[PDB]
């Protein structure tokens, strides 16, 4: 025992039921069933968030029951609200979402983690994230304070609340994909924090608090704005050549959207969100610019870091599904659509790891550092 | 291969920090044993300073290295509001992790930064004493108030949280508890902060999660489950009967006893125990409860010692915080690990990645449903 697990590569920190992931091939599955077969079928999120709580596809009558404790998180309470709104206006949008969890870690006074208890606990906290992201985006856009009322749809729900006004069934189903596609992807840095914290015994909240302070980061969850960032700052799709060859090949920086530490082929759910983000921005001018900007520089990074199986993530296209949606590029408001989503995945595995499989987490470090010396006291030094 | 099963003796990084000897109960800092630091009479800042910079500061740079740390005893008022809109009856923890998440969403132009870091980090310890002081204030019913520069960042804290002069040996009492707690390598809440700043995600995040798992009764909130065992028990004459019900057939774990790494006597707890009987001995209801937790101790040791499992670092400090002051609710002492743990935070997170920085990414084994196809609603 004296060596190092660089980044925990190929180290299994838990079993799971959930999530497997095909890395060489580019397959996932949710509970067995393939992320492109899902999308196929047109399912509802709140099927596939059934799913992960559950271990299978809801029947009709267990479909509307799952709706109703969802939208009991519709409604939160004023300080959770406040949690946000009082915060400054150009902050980031995912340590928003941070600062409103942490409020409800703080007040659930009654948590306990419990078999009978747990997926009722984390079917509402969903629901609450809905209604924590449409406050966070209200606050940033400068827009009174508004709760999600319930409907047809989690998305529509969510969508009908952030905007003020009645989504299309184009805008529902764009962000009903993105829901699914983002669920959960087994443990990545997001994931692992939030079971670290609950390896304590530690509550839910505190979990998905911890994850948060990980998605947001750039080499995560932050790429989801990160990677648009590159469409929105090359202009000119001629300029594409001479940005890429300045910023990346050089060695200056990395190409965000590319690179997985599983995937070492194109991410299933980049197909996915492509073909989605060709779509919807093809209906709006300023938007399809982005699109044929990112689609000339994916070429240049295929065949720049192919070889070395860099190829586009999930969030290398993500980020022009939300803004074919509304939604604009700033304060990391996709990080934040994604984190909406991962709450699901998130909540699932702490529960799976807490009722099946507990152990405290904690690891050791090779010690490099100054040997066994006197202390010196402060007036001879 | 298969599970690590809670990440057993795999290495996560590489430290010049901090070192432990689980078999022989040894702890030191940057090579100092913590004995020696006790026993000199050190400043807690000069220990900051150690973690900060990798050596123990001369007059000159502790009187430069107080005015950064002094710097964060101003806060926003937000960061104040993040705390005092919570109801008071909130987990003290988990209000220190609201009023470091406000921050870090606040702090929009955080760098990552060979030359910043440092500085960074003094101030946060600055600011980690004005939110612990309002975390407390709150939850007794206090109006809010910041700490004041003075003669020892302890004697800042203790004030600013009592509104009273603290005396002589409140302050040295704090001033042991701040440099026991500083750091102790990677632990589930150092772990759960690196995690996320692996991500490259801000400092104040990476303190955000490790306040997220030091929560947990099974870590740091043992500071107060351990102590909360001794309020149960009342009368040292029905110590036995409570560790027969709870413990040995209830199953339930003796708090403020095991640990990860040692499978011996905690240092800590050792130094930690010299204390609670210093200060407890003088104001008679404190004394007792004192009184009970050596008295569970021989049981605890009797049962568990030859299995490897003996006092811990929380077992006797809440009696220390108890002595100094401060009441046993809320998950207060708690709280009062965390004011100090996060230089060891700040340090570690810095540590990992300046010099060898890596996404933190590992994988789980798949036991779940086959390759399935999506069924149909009703079939099901
Ligand atoms: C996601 C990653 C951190 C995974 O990398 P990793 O498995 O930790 O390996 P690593 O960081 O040690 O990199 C290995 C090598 O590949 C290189 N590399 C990896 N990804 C990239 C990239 N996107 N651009 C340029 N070079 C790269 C890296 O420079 C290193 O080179 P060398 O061996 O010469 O030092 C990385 O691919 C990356 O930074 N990607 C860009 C940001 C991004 O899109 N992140 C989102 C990932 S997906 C979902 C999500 O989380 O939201
Ligand atoms: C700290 C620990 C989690 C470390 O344990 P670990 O290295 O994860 O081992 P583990 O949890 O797999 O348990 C191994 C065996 O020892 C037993 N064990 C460990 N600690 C205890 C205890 N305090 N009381 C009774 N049994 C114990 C446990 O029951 C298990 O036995 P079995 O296999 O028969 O169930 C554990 O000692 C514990 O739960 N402690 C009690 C709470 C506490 O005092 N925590 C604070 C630790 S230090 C400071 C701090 O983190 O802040
Ligand atoms: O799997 C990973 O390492 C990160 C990722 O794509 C996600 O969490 O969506
Ligand atoms: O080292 C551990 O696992 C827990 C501990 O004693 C601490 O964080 O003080």
Redesign the pocket.
Known sequence: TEEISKGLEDVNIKWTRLTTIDGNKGILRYGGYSVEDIIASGAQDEEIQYLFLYGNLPTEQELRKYKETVQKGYKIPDFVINAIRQLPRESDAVAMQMAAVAAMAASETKFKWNKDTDRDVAAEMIGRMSAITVNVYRHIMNMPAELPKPSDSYAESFLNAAFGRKATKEEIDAMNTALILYTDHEVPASTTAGLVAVS?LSDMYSGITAALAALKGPLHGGAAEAAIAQFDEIKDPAMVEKWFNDNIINGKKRLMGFGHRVYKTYDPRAKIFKGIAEKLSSKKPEVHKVYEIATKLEDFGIKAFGSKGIYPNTDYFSGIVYMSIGFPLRNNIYTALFALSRVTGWQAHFIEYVEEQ???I?PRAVYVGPAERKYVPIAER
């Open positions: 304590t507990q152990r405290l904690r």
